[PDB]
Design a protein around this ligand. Sequence first.
Ligand SMILES: CN1C(=O)CCc2cc(N)ccc21
Length: 123
Amino acid sequence: SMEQVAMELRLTELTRLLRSVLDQLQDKDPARIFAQPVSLKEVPDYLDHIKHPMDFATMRKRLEAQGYKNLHEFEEDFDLIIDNCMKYNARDTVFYRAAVRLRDQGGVVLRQARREVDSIGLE
Ligand SMILES: CN1C(=O)CCc2cc(N)ccc21
């Protein structure tokens, strides 16, 4: 149907915008601390602490499969990256502090992204 194609175009456009957002957020992690999943080989107790791991590579996989239906779902995953890190690591660590900086700087990006998603009407 034509309506289905139109919806898929909207999702494709949302995916394009989120790809831009993802690139901007990842730039606020210059250390690449959040680039990949935490290694369960190197950190074997991680899943005892963190029930829903997340990282930028995993987000990118879901994004390219057009697996984010709206901005809220995307933000949920970004918040997992930050929140997981701030629980597993103590305040006085390079990991926790990287998460705080990513949260603070990323908030600016996500604030305007919400306006753009609403404005263009991608949901
Ligand atoms: C994000 N993160 C942690 O939360 C602590 C465990 C860890 C190890 C390595 N190698 C990179 C990142 C992390």
